[PDB]
């Protein structure tokens, strides 16, 4: 209908925390009414990371839209999408760097997905955008 048909599945690979396990790239939305009354929870679609895609507003806007549409796409139209989209990459190296939810926003024509520094195995790139959904 609108709010998925998997529900926080992330393909099976639920690498929450506990040591450097393995990376992921989790593509959904914080789909709210307008303010923050969550119609649908994210974390149902997830792809294994392959750096190359242009990590910018252009390919964040429609990218998350295609992910949720590849689950529902029945009652979904969108009033508006927020320009200040965000990526909450969380890197769980319990050795040196440690859990840091780096909630960087976005730029129009910034940059491609960068390399994972040195002191980390498992970045948790959370491609999650707050949007104002129209449920048709």
């Amino acid at each position: 209908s609108s709010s998925f048909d998997k529900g926080k599945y992330k393909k099976g690979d639920d690498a929450s925390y506990f040591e450097p396990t393995g990376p992921y790239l989790m593509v959904n939305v914080t789909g709210v009414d307008s303010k923050g009354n969550e119609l649908l929870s994210p974390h149902y679609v997830e792809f294994p990371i392959k750096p190359g895609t242009t990590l910018t507003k252009e390919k964040i806007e429609y990218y998350v839209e295609w992910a949720l549409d590849a689950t529902a796409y029945k009652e979904f139209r969108v009033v508006e999408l927020d320009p200040s989209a965000k990526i909450e990459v969380t890197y769980y190296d319990k050795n040196k760097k440690k859990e840091e939810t780096k909630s960087f926003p976005i730029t129009e024509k910034g940059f491609v997905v960068p390399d994972l520094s040195e002191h980390i195995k498992n970045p948790g790139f959370n491609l999650i955008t707050k949007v104002v959904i129209e449920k048709k």
Side-chain angles (χ1 to χ4, degrees):
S1 297
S2 182
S3 185
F4 57 69
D5 66 284
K6 297 292 186 296
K8 301 180 267 63
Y9 179 53
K10 60 271 272 177
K11 105 180 178 64
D13 290 34
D14 192 338
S16 57
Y17 199 0
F18 189 79
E19 274 61 55
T21 49
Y24 56 92
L25 197 166
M26 189 176 294
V27 186
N28 294 109
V29 297
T30 297
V32 298
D33 70 312
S34 52
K35 181 176 175 63
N37 303 265
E38 186 170 63
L39 307 181
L40 69 98
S41 301
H43 314 152
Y44 50 106
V45 174
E46 179 275 313
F47 309 111
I49 187 156
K50 293 184 70 173
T53 188
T54 311
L55 199 297
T56 59
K57 197 272 189 69
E58 48 175 338
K59 309 195 181 65
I60 231 297
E61 178 180 88
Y62 63 76
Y63 182 52
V64 303
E65 192 174 53
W66 299 168
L68 70 91
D69 288 345
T71 310
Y73 189 63
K74 289 168 63 179
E75 301 186 86
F76 176 84
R77 170 175 168 210
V78 188
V79 182
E80 180 173 85
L81 64 98
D82 292 59
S84 299
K86 66 189 300 190
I87 295 91
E88 301 185 90
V89 64
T90 313
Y91 31 106
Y92 312 97
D93 179 66
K94 299 219 299 185
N95 299 273
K96 174 60 175 180
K97 192 65 165 187
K98 305 182 173 62
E99 183 178 75
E100 288 177 74
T101 303
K102 182 58 55 58
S103 59
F104 72 94
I106 199 58
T107 56
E108 303 305 289
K109 295 188 182 295
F111 51 84
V112 169
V113 178
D115 299 281
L116 71 175
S117 183
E118 180 179 84
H119 45 230
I120 175 65
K121 185 183 183 181
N122 71 155
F125 283 90
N126 294 328
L127 282 282
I128 298 181
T129 306
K130 179 264 175 177
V131 295
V132 187
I133 299 186
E134 177 55 70
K135 183 176 180 293
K136 62 165 171 53

